């Protein structure tokens, strides 16, 4: 029989490298998870569990539980919607929305969005990796002490409102190139703002970072490289896209998104392809010399997109057939979508115009809101 998870998660803290996600894989395919002798000497297997969103595990002698049975579709959301603090909202106001677009695509290829500005700090995917990022730190990093990161916008936005409500000081470098919300909002938030209007990326900062990090003291919790965003997004964005599909009753052949830690491509990729492998990811390459907002092109280096074993295909897209995909989502939806989402519903289209794609239901996951790029949405129109 089953124990709260939650008096477990000292294995966050100790618990090394990717060998645990084979037990995450097997879990998820067998749909069922085995009786731990002792909970406390399987560290792997109850890691394996929390990141593919157990609340209980199984204890004692034999009994294998299924994935039900452990928690993995509990309902989180209150009826009412309801909260006690925003920190309580971001946990338990999930899963985010899934959508049915009415946007036509060729060969059978049925499209929803998954509306990542549904979280409430940034607006956007970067509060997940954020709140779990910020959440591990609390047990280890005294209060008040300064965590900082490099951004393109939402990242920081979200590091910012959240290392503020754990009691954390907060500090952004963004490229001058980073759109408004991201340079201003962290200070409205609290947060100390470094730009470098020379800096062409975002990655191209890192250097800076680690070395005023070295002077200063500070914790870089570096979003590119922390294990904790593809957790956070193991357990919330990927299990949400099978819990949302199975309970949708939806014929999931596939996912399409973005890619810029690759955080959550990265778990909603591998999380779906441990369940049924035949499962695609389509992901966007922002076709060379352009720029998309908070996203890049796969070799200028991502963690878990290389290191896990996930089957992928990209297809390049260009700013402007990215913007080209906000203005048919908004016309069609009435959704306002930011740059990265049009580009992953872009990505999506471009394959089913091929004729890859094996006709069914499609999720797209939505980085965030077009309200926030009102000049790239501008300059779509004219
Ligand atoms: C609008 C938008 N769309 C897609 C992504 C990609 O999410 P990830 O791959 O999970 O980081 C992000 C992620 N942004 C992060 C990472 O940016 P970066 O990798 O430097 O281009 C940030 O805000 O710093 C985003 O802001």
């Given at each position: 029989a089953?124990?709260?998870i939650s008096?477990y998660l000292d294995?966050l803290?100790?618990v090394?490298?990717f060998?645990?996600?084979?037990?995450?894989?097997?879990?998820?395919?067998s749909g069922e998870?085995?009786?731990?002798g002792?909970?406390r000497s399987?560290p792997?297997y109850?890691?394996?569990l929390?990141?593919?969103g157990?609340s209980r595990?199984?204890?004692?002698d034999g009994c294998?539980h299924?994935?039900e049975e452990?928690?993995?579709?509990?309902?989180?959301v209150?009826?009412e919607m309801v909260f006690?603090?925003?920190?309580?909202?971001?946990?338990?106001?999930?899963?985010?929305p899934?959508?049915?677009?009415?946007?036509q695509?060729?060969?059978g290829?049925?499209?929803?969005?998954?509306?990542?500005?549904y979280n409430?700090f940034?607006?956007?995917?970067?509060?997940?990796?954020?709140?779990?990022?910020?959440?591990?730190?609390?047990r280890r990093?005294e209060?008040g002490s300064?965590?900082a990161?490099?951004?393109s916008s939402?990242?920081g936005?979200?590091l910012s409102?959240?290392?503020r409500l754990?009691?954390?000081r907060?500090?952004?470098?963004?490229?001058g190139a980073?759109?408004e919300?991201?340079?201003?909002?962290?200070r409205?938030?609290?947060?100390?703002?470094?730009?470098?209007?020379?800096?062409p990326?975002?990655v191209?900062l890192?250097?800076?970072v680690?070395?005023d990090?070295?002077?200063?003291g500070?914790?870089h919790?570096?979003?590119?490289?922390n294990?904790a965003?593809?957790?956070?997004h193991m357990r919330?964005?990927?299990?949400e896209?099978?819990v949302?599909?199975?309970?949708?009753?939806?014929?999931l052949?596939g996912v399409?998104?973005?890619?810029?830690?690759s955080?959550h491509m990265?778990?909603?990729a591998?999380?779906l392809?441990?369940?049924?492998?035949?499962?695609?990811a389509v992901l966007?390459?922002?076709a060379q010399?352009?720029?998309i907002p908070?996203?890049r092109?796969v070799?200028?280096g991502?963690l878990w997109?290389?290191?896990?074993?996930?089957?992928?295909?990209?297809?390049?897209?260009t700013?402007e057939e990215?913007?080209?995909?906000?203005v048919?989502?908004?016309?069609?939806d009435?959704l306002?979508?930011?740059?990265?989402?049009?580009?992953?519903?872009?990505?999506?289209?471009?394959k089913?115009?091929?004729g890859?794609?094996?006709?069914?239901?499609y999720?797209?996951?939505?980085?965030?809101?077009?309200?926030?790029?009102?000049?790239?949405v501008?300059?779509?129109l004219?």
């Amino acid at each position: 029989a089953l124990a709260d998870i939650s008096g477990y998660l000292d294995v966050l803290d100790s618990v090394r490298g990717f060998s645990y996600l084979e037990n995450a894989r097997e879990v998820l395919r067998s749909g069922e998870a085995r009786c731990l002798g002792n909970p406390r000497s399987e560290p792997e297997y109850v890691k394996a569990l929390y990141v593919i969103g157990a609340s209980r595990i199984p204890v004692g002698d034999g009994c294998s539980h299924t994935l039900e049975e452990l928690g993995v579709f509990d309902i989180s959301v209150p009826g009412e919607m309801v909260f006690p603090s925003p920190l309580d909202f971001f946990e338990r106001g999930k899963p985010t929305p899934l959508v049915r677009s009415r946007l036509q695509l060729p060969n059978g290829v049925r499209v929803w969005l998954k509306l990542e500005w549904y979280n409430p700090f940034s607006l956007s995917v970067a509060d997940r990796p954020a709140v779990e990022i910020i959440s591990r730190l609390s047990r280890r990093v005294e209060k008040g002490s300064l965590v900082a990161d490099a951004t393109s916008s939402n990242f920081g936005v979200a590091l910012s409102a959240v290392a503020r409500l754990y009691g954390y000081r907060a500090r952004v470098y963004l490229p001058g190139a980073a759109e408004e919300f991201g340079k201003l909002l962290p200070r409205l938030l609290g947060a100390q703002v470094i730009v470098d209007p020379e800096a062409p990326s975002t990655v191209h900062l890192l250097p800076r970072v680690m070395k005023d990090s070295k002077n200063e003291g500070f914790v870089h919790v570096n979003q590119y490289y922390n294990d904790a965003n593809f957790e956070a997004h193991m357990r919330g964005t990927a299990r949400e896209i099978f819990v949302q599909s199975r309970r949708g009753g939806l014929a999931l052949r596939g996912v399409a998104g973005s890619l810029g830690t690759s955080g959550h491509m990265s778990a909603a990729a591998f999380y779906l392809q441990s369940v049924d492998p035949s499962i695609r990811a389509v992901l966007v390459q922002p076709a060379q010399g352009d720029s998309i907002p908070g996203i890049r092109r796969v070799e200028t280096g991502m963690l878990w997109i290389n290191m896990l074993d996930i089957s992928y295909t990209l297809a390049e897209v260009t700013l402007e057939e990215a913007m080209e995909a906000v203005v048919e989502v908004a016309r069609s939806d009435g959704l306002v979508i930011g740059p990265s989402g049009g580009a992953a519903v872009k990505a999506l289209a471009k394959k089913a115009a091929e004729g890859d794609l094996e006709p069914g239901d499609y999720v797209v996951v939505v980085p965030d809101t077009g309200f926030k790029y009102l000049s790239l949405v501008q300059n779509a129109l004219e």
